[PDB]
C-alpha cells in the first residue's frame, strides 16, 4: 500500500514520545507522519513553515496543535488551507478555537463545538437552574451573529418564558478613552449574562464590568470555549463564578487527538482512492497557487467529514467543526481554578450541582 505524507505540527508541546506512541491502518493507503516542532505563531512563521514543508516533502494533509490562547491561529490556517487546497485539522489550542465563516475553498476542520452547539448548551444550563432572564454581550469577533441568532431563534420557538432583555455589541477595534464600553455595560440589568468574544477581549470587558459592579453576586457570566481557552492560564480579571463550556484537553488527550487526526486524513484519502482511483497531488508549492488552481479542488472534503476510525464516529460538519463532541462544563471557583461541574453528552446535560455553591 502506497504512502501519503502527513505533517503533524506541534507548537510549544512536548508529549512528543507519548504522541508517536499513540500512533493500525488496514486501508488502501498508509500514513507517513512527520512530527514538526514550531516555536512561533505569527502569520509569517506559520505560513513559511507549512509552505517549506509542502515544498520539501509531499504533504497530503496537516494535523496542527498548539499550546496558546491565540484564536488568530485558526484564521491563518483557514487561509492557508483555502489557498493551497490542503486539508488542515486544528485539533488543540488557538488552532481549535471556532473559526466562523471558513472560506468556500477551505479544507480546514476543527476539533471542538460549533458556535450554535455552545449557544444551545448555554441555554440548557440556564434552563436547569431556571435562569430565564438574561442579556447578551458580544464583540465583533466573527461568529457573534451566529451566536445571537441561534439564541434568539431557540427562545422565540419555546414555551419557556425566556426574557432576552438586552443585546450589547462592543466595538473593540477602537480605543476606549471615552469610556464607551463602560457606558454600554452600565445598561445591563439581567442576572445572567452571555458573553461571546475572545479571551483577551474578555479580560478587558471583565475589568470594566467589575468597575461598575456587574461581576459580584447576583450576576453570573457564561462564556464559550475560546474565552476560557487554556484553563491553566487564568487572567486575574476573570471573576469567580464564571461558567464556561470547554473542550480544552479534558478527557480527550492531545496524544489521542493526533492519532484521530492522522486517521481522518488517512481514511479520507483511502476512501477517495477507492472510489475514484486517484487522490489529489500534494501541492509542490504555495508560491504558484495562481497557475495551478484550475488543477486543484476541495474534492477530498466530502470524504474528510465522514470518517469513522476505531469504531468511533469522527464526523465533521461541512462548516468545519466536530459533529458531536462531549463537552465539559467548568466553573472558576473561589481558588481561581477551573473546576468540572458538568458534562454535555449524548445531547443531554448532566450537572454536578443542584444549587450553585458560594463564589
Amino acid at each position: 500500500p502506497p504512502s501519503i505524507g502527513i505533517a503533524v505540527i506541534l507548537v510549544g508541546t512536548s508529549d512528543e514520545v507519548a504522541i508517536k506512541d499513540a500512533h493500525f491502518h488496514h486501508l488502501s493507503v498508509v500514513p507517513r507522519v512527520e512530527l514538526v516542532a514550531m516555536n512561533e505563531t505569527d502569520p509569517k512563521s506559520i505560513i513559511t513553515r507549512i509552505c517549506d514543508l509542502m515544498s520539501d516533502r509531499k504533504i497530503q494533509g496537516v494535523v496542527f496543535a498548539d499550546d496558546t490562547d491565540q484564536e488568530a491561529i485558526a484564521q491563518i490556517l483557514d487561509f492557508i488551507s483555502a489557498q493551497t487546497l490542503t486539508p488542515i485539522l486544528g485539533i488543540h489550542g488557538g488552532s481549535s478555537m471556532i473559526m466562523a465563516d471558513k472560506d468556500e475553498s477551505s479544507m480546514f476542520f476543527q476539533f471542538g463545538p460549533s458556535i450554535e452547539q455552545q449557544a444551545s448548551v448555554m441555554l440548557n444550563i440556564m434552563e436547569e437552574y431556571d435562569w430565564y432572564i438574561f442579556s447578551i454581550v458580544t464583540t465583533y469577533f466573527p461568529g457573534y451573529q451566529d451566536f445571537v441568532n441561534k439564541i434568539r431563534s431557540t427562545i422565540e420557538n419555546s414555551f419557556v418564558g425566556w426574557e432576552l432583555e438586552e443585546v450589547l455589541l462592543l466595538d473593540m477595534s477602537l480605543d476606549d478613552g471615552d469610556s464607551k464600553i463602560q457606558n454600554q455595560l452600565k445598561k445591563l440589568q439581567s442576572p445572567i449574562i452571555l458573553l461571546y468574544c475572545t479571551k483577551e477581549e474578555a479580560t478587558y470587558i471583565f475589568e470594566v464590568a467589575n468597575s461598575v459592579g456587574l461581576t459580584g453576586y447576583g450576576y453570573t457570566w457564561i462564556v464559550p470555549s475560546l474565552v476560557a481557552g487554556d484553563t491553566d492560564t487564568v487572567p486575574s480579571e476573570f471573576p469567580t463564578g464564571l461558567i464556561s463550556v470547554s473542550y480544552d484537553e479534558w478527557d480527550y488527550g492531545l496524544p489521542a487527538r493526533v492519532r484521530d487526526g492522522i486517521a481522518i486524513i488517512t481514511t479520507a484519502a483511502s476512501d477517495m482512492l477507492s472510489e475514484h482511483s486517484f487522490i489529489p497531488e500534494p501541492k509542490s508549492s504555495c508560491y504558484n497557487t495562481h497557475e495551478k488552481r484550475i488543477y486543484q479542488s476541495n474534492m477530498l472534503n466530502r470524504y474528510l467529514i465522514n470518517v469513522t476510525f476505531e469504531g468511533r464516529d469522527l464526523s465533521f460538519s461541512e462548516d468545519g467543526y466536530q459533529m458531536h463532541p462531549k463537552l465539559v462544563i467548568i466553573l472558576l471557583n473561589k481558588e481561581r481554578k477551573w473546576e468540572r461541574v458538568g458534562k454535555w453528552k449524548d445531547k443531554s446535560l448532566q450537572m454536578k450541582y443542584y444549587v450553585w455553591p458560594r463564589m
Binding site: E40, T41, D42, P43, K44, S45, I47, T48, C51, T68, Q70, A72, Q75, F79, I80, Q83, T84, D101, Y140, F141, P142, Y144, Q145, D171, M172, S173, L174, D175, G177, C286, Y287, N288, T289, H290
Partner: protein, 359 residues
Amino acid sequence: DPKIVNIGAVLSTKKHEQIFREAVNQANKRHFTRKIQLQATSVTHRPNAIQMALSVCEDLISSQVYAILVSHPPALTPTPISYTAGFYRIPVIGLTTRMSIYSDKSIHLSFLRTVPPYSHQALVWFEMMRLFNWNHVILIVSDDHEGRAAQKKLETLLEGGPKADKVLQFEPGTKNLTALLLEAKELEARVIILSASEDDATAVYKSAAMLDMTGAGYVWLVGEREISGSALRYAPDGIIGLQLINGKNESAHISDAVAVVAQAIHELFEMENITDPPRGCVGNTNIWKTGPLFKRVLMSSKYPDGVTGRIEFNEDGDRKFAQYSIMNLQNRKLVQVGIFNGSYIIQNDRKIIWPGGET
C-alpha cells in the same frame, strides 16, 4: 532630530510607487516635521495571496508601518493585506476597492477607504427618487453579499416618503429571469432599481427586453457595474446609471489618502503614550496597542480639499461625500446628464431621455 514614521503602500505599478513617495515627501514639506517625519515604504501586488501576505510581513511591517495604503489590483484582492495588517491592528486604507464586503468589521477590523462601496449608490438613487418624485419603486438585486448590501442600504433610507413596493432577489448566474421579471411587470410601479454584477445585469436586460419592460412607461435606475462591459452592451436605451468620479484614478487616491494619513499621524502624536508598531511579524503575536487609537483618529479625520473632493469616513470607515456622474444611455451612448456632488444632485444642460422616447 526627528522620529521617522513609516507609511506603507501596496500599489499597482512602480509609477504609482513614485507618486506615493512624492506625496509623502510633500506631506513632509507641508507639515511641521521637527518632531515626526514620514517615510514611504512600498511594494507592488504579489502574484498570489500567500506571497502577498508574506510581503506585507517582510517588506512593510518589518519597517514598522503605522498604516498601509492598498490599491485594488488592476488585472487577487486587498484581503490578504487587510488580514495580515489586521492581525496587528495596523490600519489599511483602501484606495479603489468598492466591494461592500470590506465594510464588515468582523472580517476587516482595521479597514478604511477613500472610495465608497457599491452599496452607497443607494444614497444617490434615493435623492433621485426625491428629485424626480418616484414614490414607488421595484428593487431587483442579486442574492449575494453585494446585492443584499444595496438592498439594506436603500431600505434604511426608505424606512426611516418614497416606498419600495417590492424587493426581488435572484440567484447570481441565472440566465432566464422572466419569472422574476413577470412578478415585477404585474406590479403597478414602473420604476425599477437594479443591483447586480456585469454578467447578471446582462441577463436581466435581455429578459426584460423580451418582456417589453424596457420601453416607454418604465424607468431603469442602476449603478456602475450594471453599465459596464457586457451589461452596457445589452442595456436598454434611456437607462440611468452612475460612475464614481476618480473611482479608478489610483494616483488621485494616493494623493488624498497620504494627505489624510499624514494629518492623522501628526494628530496622533499630540497625544501621550504612543507606542511603536511591531517590527516584523516573526515572533510577534500581540496587537499594536496604539493601533485602535490610531484607527479612531483616522475615522474622524476630515480633509476638505481633496483631489477626489471632501474626505470624511462613516461609522464603517467608508468614504462619505463621494461624487458620481449620472449617466443616461441615449442612442447607445452613455451621456452625462448631471452629477451628485457629494450631497446634492446637479442636473446639467443635457436633457435626459427616458426609456421609450420620453422627455
